[PDB]
Amino acid sequence: AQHDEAQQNAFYQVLNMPNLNADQRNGFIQSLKDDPSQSANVLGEAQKLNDSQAPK
């Protein structure tokens, strides 16, 4: 929305991964920063990891 806020939205989502512990989500944040074009991939990986580590 508004513009290409892909970076922002991906960053916010990766932060708000309640099942991930700090090191993992921080890892994905650094991956986002390093690979800005790959924010979609980084987000995908983060969400998949969060899902797999879900308590149930």
Swiss-Prot record:
Transmembrane segments: none annotated. Immunoglobulin-binding region E repeats lie at residues 1-56. It is found in: Secreted, Cell wall. Important immunodiagnostic reagent because of its ability to bind the Fab and Fc fragments of a wide range of mammalian immunoglobulins. Belongs to the immunoglobulin-binding protein SpA family. Each of the immunoglobulin-binding region repeats can bind the Fc region of an immunoglobulin. Plays a role in the inhibition of the host innate and adaptive immune responses. Possesses five immunoglobulin-binding domains that capture both the fragment crystallizable region (Fc region) and the Fab region (part of Ig that identifies antigen) of immunoglobulins. In turn, Staphylococcus aureus is protected from phagocytic killing via inhibition of Ig Fc region. In addition, the host elicited B-cell response is prevented due to a decrease of antibody-secreting cell proliferation that enter the bone marrow, thereby decreasing long-term antibody production. Interacts with host TNFRSF1A; this interaction leads to the stimulation of both surface expression and shedding of TNFRSF1A. This is Immunoglobulin G-binding protein A. The lineage of its organism: Bacteria, Bacillati, Bacillota, Bacilli, Bacillales. The gene is spa. The chain holds residues 37 to 92 of 508 of the full protein.
